[PDB]
């Protein structure tokens with residue numbers, strides 16, 4: 001059940017019920033990427049410009065774009081007229097001296113202001129360990145309730161992004177984390193699918209680390225294909241809400257092969273909010289060679305990434321208009 | 325200007341014939357400290373919760389509603405008169421005295437949804453505001469109130485915004501220095517948060533004057549004539565079209581009551597009060613020292629007399645909030 005306005009906004013973010021969205025709200029993550037190629041700290045102008053370049057060159061090929069309000073408003077104004085807009089509402093990153101990873105809204109923003117800035121959706125990122133401290137998770141659930149209520153009042157779709165972790169596992173790329181990932185992802189989805197959180201779309205990880213799956217793995221194999229497939233069916237069984245996948249910065253090819261595997265396995269996912277798998281290469285070029293070189297990278301390599309993704313989405317994603 | 329069906333029903337449960345006679349008892353750290361004064365042991369959760377229940381049970385039959393804190397006040401809320409509405413506070417108490425920003429912060433495991441689920445007919449939130457303060461601080465404060473106002477719209481529960489004014493550069497808001505600017509701080513803060521975007525249903529505000537410096541009411545130095553004081557009330561009435569009620573903290577019951585009369589004479593159309601310590605402060609010493617049954621007897625006699633006298637004054641001074649609809 002969508003209100004008239006939430007439905008209109010979902011339509012502006014989608015094509016034929018599929019979300020082929022471009023993600024560039026990266027801030028903390030962007031900065032870590034930029035640091036690989038220069039000693040100097042990134043300036044505001046540089047961040048704004050790279051976002052604007054990606055927006056201008058690639059949104060003609062996306063149903064919508066996700067940007068951050070801190071650096072991304074100029075970029076939002078040069079997006080394709082056919083592409084919708086999501087704006088991020090959370091502060092970037094988390095405190096690495098504690099395990100709680102508590103969420104925090106941008107200080108001078110509200111769901112109302114995000115709508116006033118021309119967004120068709122509010123996006124919020126929550127770090128969640130289903131097995132973690134219960135009082136921490138109580139605080140997290142309470143915080144999402146507030147945001148869900150705001151979005152109900154402002155009549156703007158609520159896109160909740162969940163990134164999972166384990167309080168006691170330092171590296172979520174490790175085999176140790178791979179072994180519990182499906183549990184973390186699928187049980188978190190089940191919680192945040194509860195009516196009281198007011199989510200319209202879940203933006204989630206695939207429930208497997210594909211690098212440890214038979215046929216995809218280049219080293220140790222932790223899972224057969226059938227086991228991986230069952231993780232995807234468990235994910236589909238964990239919600240009746242629309243959901244879309246994030247890339248997590250894997251290779252464009254691995255992400256594409258994952259979508260194919262997801263669909264074959266029985267996951268009726270409704271699109272992607274994909275960023276780095278598409279544009280990651282532009283960061284090095286932008287820093288070393290500058291804006292025009294980056295533009296040319298975007299028109300060629302960038303386009304090729306997003307075009308190949310779109311072809312894969314076309315044959316793998318399911319429309320959210322059927323979740324209704 | 326307008327109320328949904330459920331917000332209107334809730335407002336009616338909070339009032340009597342359009343007048344809010346609300347009993348305030350969301351005190352936390354403040355209440356605990358009073359308690360200490362009368363006894364040796366650190367006050368217990370048991371004690372803090374019990375006094376609230378006694379006050380709630382014995383005095384809410386004579387109030388239109390009661391304001392409680394979710395942290396200690398839920399048991400007290402459940403023994404309130406069935407004819408009394410409930411407001412629950414949503415803010416963390418106090419402020420960082422090392423800084424001047426006094427930023428607002430909601431209780432960590434509460435939401436407007438949870439407040440409604442706990443049986444409340446209103447969400448109360450206390451904001452400290454200096455209209456003349458740091459513009460980025462105030463931008464952050466405005467964003468925060470927008471969020472809560474949106475929550476309350478979605479959960480369809482009245483939003484009561486309490487504003488307490490201060491100056492970043494004046495330590496004592498009881499000083500003559502603050503008195504000279506208080507009308508400015510109060511009235512301009514009301515103008516800000518009366519804007520539609522903040523979603524406020526009722527403002528809970530200070531009287532726009534320190535009556536202790538007004539001619540006729542002052543024991544010492546006199547800063548204002550009666551006419552100057554009255555103009556401040558008329559300016560306050562003109563600062564909002566929303567319902568608003570007065571908070572009493574800072575003055576004696578007798579002076580508060582005299583203030584209500586002066587307010588009405590001056591042309592203020594206030595819609596009630598949120599009155600606390602005046603009404604039950606006396607039981608606190610009796611509860612700690614003579615036990616619970618003694619407090620119940622104090623509340624039934626002195627306690628009733630206090631709230632009854634207040635109600636008699638409200639009857640001749642307050643205006644119904646339905647005349648603002």
Ligand SMILES: O=P(O)(O)OC[C@@H](O)[C@@H](O)[C@H](O)[C@H](O)COP(=O)(O)O
Pocket residue numbers: 023025026027028029030091092093125161163246247248249273274275276277
């Ligand atoms: O840490 P930051 O600086 O806030 O940004 C990265 C982080 O939010 C990620 O979760 C992305 O927002 C999301 O995954 C979409 O990007 P991709 O994963 O598709 O590349």
Ligand SMILES: [Ca+2]
Pocket residue numbers: 193194195
């Ligand atoms: Ca449901």
Ligand SMILES: [Ca+2]
Pocket residue numbers: 236237238239240241
């Ligand atoms: Ca399902």
Ligand SMILES: [Cl-]
Pocket residue numbers: 350351352353354355417
């Ligand atoms: Cl207190």
